[PDB]
Structure 1
Amino acid sequence: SPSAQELKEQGNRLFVGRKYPEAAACYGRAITRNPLVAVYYTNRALCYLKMQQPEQALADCRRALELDGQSVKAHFFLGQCQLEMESYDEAIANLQRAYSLAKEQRLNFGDDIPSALRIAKKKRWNSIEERRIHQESELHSYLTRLIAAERERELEECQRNHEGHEDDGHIRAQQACIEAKHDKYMADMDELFSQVDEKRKKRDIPDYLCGKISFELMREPCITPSGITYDRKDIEEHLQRVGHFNPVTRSPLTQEQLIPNLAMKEVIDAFISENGWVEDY
């Protein structure tokens, strides 16, 4: 009896009311009523995501796009899902694409995309990073076991030394007691092989090295009278595609007022020149 346009509104009220499983089911009746409407699917897709079930959302997006391959939201959400499924490559791609469309269609979300985009780039890198081998070392592999050895000679050759004088309760603490003595002795070591000119140290890219708009590494940093540093290429268009105001302080800014942050370029250059990765990031 209720119209699809009414069922959507209903779900809209629920979703705002955080009743995600209920709103989603509400969009489902509006879809059976009229499949040919992209909004429904993308909306329901957002319910599934909030309901932590990319399985469904992924499918529902793969339908909203069949009725609108130019859907910014559909692409954004689709990419989102892929993140959960851990398809880091595709995910960042659809976000990338969902970003261009949004820019193209002259839509405005701000951060919402470059942010999640930058986030998906970070969560991706995190993967192949913990996937590296680092390759122990000649002296390492050696001393590494020398300790594990000295440990057995105690826990398994000095613990049962007094099965009576030290029952379960006693040496159960006398066990981890020495274990920590060795887990640390070695701990100090690890830091040695890491600070010893070794690249085995976690490789990540700072934040103060990215733009306040692009949310990515800057190649032509320049600051404003306010003091915020953006990439000359991003606040370039924002000045001729959104207005004449600082995208942060919202101050009356104008293109011929941008100062080149030379000291920054330096810092950014030096970074790259030292970090092999990146470009792969």
Structure 2
Amino acid sequence: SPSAQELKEQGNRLFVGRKYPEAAACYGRAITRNPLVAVYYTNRALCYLKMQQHEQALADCRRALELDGQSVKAHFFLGQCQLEMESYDEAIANLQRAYSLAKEQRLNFGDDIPSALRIAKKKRWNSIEERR
């Protein structure tokens, strides 16, 4: 009965309310109405990250990237997913690509992207140092 945009808006309200599995289901309903909108998959990927569902998050980021190759958030969420999975070099590349795309698109997130890069590079270093 509701449209894809209305379902996305319902998902966004649930997300702000910290109802992550419910928000993800709402983005799934939006996808039923229009499966060609990258934002539905990026939003759902972020829900899956919060739910520790990394395999599902990775899959959504890949779907989003097939639809919008320039998506800052798909690259960023992909990098965060790879960092939590300890795939540090891939994570850093995707975070750096998010930074470059954000610069080209004149987007600013209060230094979130550089901050995440530093967190990722520090985690990678900690894993290297612990072998010593």
TM-score, normalised relative to structure 1: 0.46
CA distance in 1, matches of 2:46, 2:105: 21
SS at match of 1:86: coil
Distance (whole Å) between structure 2 residues aligned to residue 82 and residue 49 of structure 1:
11
Q: Deviations over 1:121-150 (max 9, x none)?
A: 000111111112xxxxxxxxxxxxxxxxxx
Cα distance between partner residues in 2 of 1:127 and 1:53:
23
Q: CA deviation at 1:94?
A: 0.4
Give the superposition deviation at 1:50: 1.0
TM-score by length of 2: 0.97
CA distance in 2, matches of 1:110, 1:90: 23
CA shift at 1:110, angstroms? 2.6
- 1:68 and 2:68 correspond: yes
CA deviation profile, 1:40-81 (whole Å, cap 9, x unmatched): 000001101111221111100001010111000110001010
Structure 2: stretches of 5+ with no match in the other structure: none
Separation (CA, whole Å) in 2 of partners of 1:11 and 1:106: 26
| Alignment deviations for residues 235-268 of structure 1 (CA, whole Å, 9 cap, x no partner) | xxxxxxxxxxxxxxxxxxxxxxxxxxxxxxxxxx
Listed one character per residue, the Cα deviations across residues 179-237 of structure 1 (whole Å, up to 9, x for unaligned) are xxxxxxxxxxxxxxxxxxxxxxxxxxxxxxxxxxxxxxxxxxxxxxxxxxxxxxxxxxx
* Structure 2: distance between partners of 1:106 and 1:93: 20
Distance in 2 (CA, whole Å) between partners of 1:108 and 1:127 is 30
**Aligned partners of 2:85, 2:33: CA distance in 1, in Å?**
30
C-alpha distance in 2, partners of 1:6/1:30?
Answer: 8
Distance 1:20 1:45 in 2: 11
- Distance across 2 between alignment mates of 1:115 and 1:108: 12
Tell me how far apart the structure 2 counterparts of residues 89 and 55 of structure 1 sit (CA, whole Å).
18
Deviation at 1:85, TM superposition (A): 1.2
SS at match of 1:44: helix
Q: Which secondary structure does the structure 1 equivalent of 2:67 belong to?
A: coil
**Residues of 1 paired with 2:110 and 2:104: CA distance?**
14
CA RMSD for the aligned pairs? Answer: 0.8
Partner Cα separation in structure 1 for residue 71 and residue 21 of structure 2: 24
Distance 1:35 1:21 in 2: 19
**4+ runs deviating over 4 angstroms:** none
**CA offset digits 1:73-99 (Å, max 9, x no partner):** 110001010011110000010001100
Q: Which has the higher contact order (CA 8 A, sep 6+)?
A: 2
Higher alpha-carbon Rg: 1
Measure, in 2, the Cα distance between the counterparts of 1:20 and 1:130: 35
SS in 2 for 1:75: helix
Residue 26 of structure 1, CA deviation: 0.7
Structure 1 residue 32, shift from structure 2 partner:
1.8
**CA separation in 1, counterparts of 2:5 and 2:86?**
35
Give aligned pairs, total.
Answer: 132
Q: Distance in 1 between matches of 2:21 and 2:37?
A: 21
Residues of 2 paired with 1:121 and 1:110: CA distance?
19
